[PDB]
Amino acid sequence: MFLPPPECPVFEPSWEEFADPFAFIHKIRPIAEQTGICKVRPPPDWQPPFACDVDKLHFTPRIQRLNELEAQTRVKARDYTLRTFGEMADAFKSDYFNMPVHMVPTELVEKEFWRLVSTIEEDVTVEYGADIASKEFGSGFPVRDGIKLSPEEEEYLDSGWNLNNMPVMEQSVLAHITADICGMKLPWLYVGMCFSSFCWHIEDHWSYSINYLHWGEPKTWYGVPGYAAEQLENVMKKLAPKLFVSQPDLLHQLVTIMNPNTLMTHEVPVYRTNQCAGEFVITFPRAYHSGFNQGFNFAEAVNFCTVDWLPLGRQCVEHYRLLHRYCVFSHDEMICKMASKADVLDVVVASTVQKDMAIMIEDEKALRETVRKLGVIDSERMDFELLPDDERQCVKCKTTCFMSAISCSCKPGLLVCLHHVKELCSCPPYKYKLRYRYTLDDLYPMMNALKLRAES
Ligand SMILES: NCCc1cnn(-c2nccc3c(=O)[nH]cnc23)c1
Ligand SMILES: [Mn+2]
Ligand SMILES: [Mn+2]
Ligand SMILES: [Zn+2]
């Protein structure tokens, strides 16, 4: 038996409220952060025209075995065209229920999905055109191409809700990042079929996510607020400890399907929604989400970071350190890049960056004092941003170093962060060197530039 979780919040903004996606996300935040997920219905007349081909888009989907609490990789079979996939997906659903596809109630597909995943005896497998990059097969939204676009497509070219534009807006903080982070700046496409699913997870660096269902049958979502994150993790650890083991890579991350009633029984707040064609779903920082597709569909998604997120981004990197998890980027490097462009930053952005930079500088001061008292006397400036990520990870916690690291003449090429000085080599401290990006003296004027920009 399945007891559907309560409905998540649904917003229907006016053209005025809709005008700015970031001001709207800030306005809904007090409500939506209590549920983790929320649904946004654009004004009735906001209708972008679709941009991908049925016979020219090709993809190899991931095969999915429908088994609850069975470990799966976050990212990992034949070739399909969007047309051939749809024929397969439609024949599957209609044969499964012995009904015309539009006639299958959503409540029934939902109950069936949850029965199916818990029944050991049924070995149902589906396919999911998941994490297809927008860079290669193109966005479902209009984009500037050196092809001719109809004035209808030109209306939506510069919309903040066109998911190609959201990352590069000034209210976005990932915009300013020069470093290669294609997984967090570029949209991903999801070609679903009945029962194709996404396991319980959170976004990298606890970022927000925005998902648009371009067309097709609904996408069913389950969401948990950010405040209940550790509570969900404690529940999932007791029932499936197998996927909670330490991982030596980001590409090897273990996720699973878990019934939301199991979470609800353990007093974890869970909300649901059926996202229909033309609707958006926004996931908030550290908000756990999972779901499945009701049928053949096409969605597009991108991650994003607001000014509200900056302190959480710092807390996340601190959490990755404790867990020995690899970072996608250095948060401190991002803060310093924004500090270096203080003059061109939005005044609200500059103000928030300044507040995080003050924390970073104060933590750096303490860490430098501690490593001096450990006997590390020699020091040399280092341009950490020039090193490939694999060349600047803490041997112990795997953090991407930016502000500083410790090196040893005994272990060439190896680096530790200032938290793990004792993990580097087995040589005396006088043989170590403090490698730093900036002196404390260079850092205070970088912060003053931000203060001048925010005070203007
Ligand atoms: N490389 C990105 C990995 C990633 C991060 N979130 N996520 C998802 N979140 C939300 C929704 C979906 C979905 O509808 N289908 C597949 N995946 C989804 C996937
Ligand atoms: Mn099963
Ligand atoms: Mn997600
Ligand atoms: Zn470390």
From Swiss-Prot:
Subcellular location: Nucleus
Domain named JmjC: residues: 155-321
Tissue: Ubiquitously expressed, with highest levels in testis. Down-regulated in melanoma and glioblastoma. Up-regulated in breast cancer (at protein level).
Chain ranges of the JmjN domain: 8-49
Binding site for Fe cation: 201, 203, 289
Highest rank taxon of the organism: Eukaryota
Record-listed 2-oxoglutarate binding positions: 128, 209, 211, 219
ZnF start-end (C5HC2): 394-446
Illness the protein is tied to: Intellectual developmental disorder, autosomal recessive 65: A disorder characterized by significantly below average general intellectual functioning associated with impairments in adaptive behavior and manifested during the developmental period. MRT65 patients have moderate to severe intellectual disability, developmental delay, and facial dysmorphism. Camptodactyly is present in some patients.
Quaternary organization: Interacts with FOXG1B, PAX9, MYC, MYCN and RB1. Interacts with HDAC1, HDAC4, HDAC5 and HDAC7. Interacts (via PHD-type 1 zinc finger) with histone H3 unmodified at 'Lys-4'; the interaction is inhibited when histone H3 is methylated at 'Arg-2' or 'Lys-4'.
Domain notes: Both the JmjC domain and the JmjN domain are required for enzymatic activity. However ARID and PHD-type 1 domain are not required for activity per se but contributed to recognition of the H3(1-21)K4me2 substrate peptide. The 2 first PHD-type zinc finger domains are required for transcription repression activity.
Function summary: Histone demethylase that demethylates 'Lys-4' of histone H3, thereby playing a central role in histone code. Does not demethylate histone H3 'Lys-9' or H3 'Lys-27'. Demethylates trimethylated, dimethylated and monomethylated H3 'Lys-4'. Acts as a transcriptional corepressor for FOXG1B and PAX9. Favors the proliferation of breast cancer cells by repressing tumor suppressor genes such as BRCA1 and HOXA5. In contrast, may act as a tumor suppressor for melanoma. Represses the CLOCK-BMAL1 heterodimer-mediated transcriptional activation of the core clock component PER2.
Family per similarity comment: Belongs to the JARID1 histone demethylase family.
Official protein name in the record: Lysine-specific demethylase 5B
Organism: Homo sapiens
Residues of the full protein shown: 26 to 754 of 1544
